[PDB]
């Protein structure tokens, strides 16, 4: 849907992100730029152009590039909300 949930088996993620509140760029959120071929992210259905919305409940819809990078890097069971537009 316009917004979806992806259950990554956290335990490397095989994905690349671009954007942020200060470095907002085109694929004003933090957007998925690349996804490795065999990476966990690709197996889990995460698509290029998806704007990451939240990481295990922590919203990134308006978060610094590094703030989002740290969110995806410390989810502590993992769930990522995305915006497919």
């Amino acid at each position: 849907g316009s917004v979806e949930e992806i259950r990554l088996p956290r335990a490397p993620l095989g994905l690349s992100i671009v954007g942020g509140s200060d470095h907002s760029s085109h694929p004003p959120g933090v957007f998925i730029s690349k996804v490795l071929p065999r990476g966990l992210a690709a197996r889990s259905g995460l698509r290029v152009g998806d704007r990451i919305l939240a990481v295990n409940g922590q919203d990134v819809r308006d978060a610094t590039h590094q703030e989002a990078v740290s969110a995806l890097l410390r989810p502590c069971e993992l769930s990522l909300l995305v915006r497919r537009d």
Binding site: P12, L13, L15, S16, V18, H23, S24, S25, Q66, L73
Partner: peptide, 10 residues
Amino acid sequence: TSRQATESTV
């Protein structure tokens, strides 16, 4: 868009 396109692979 703006400039300084930063990308981070996780």
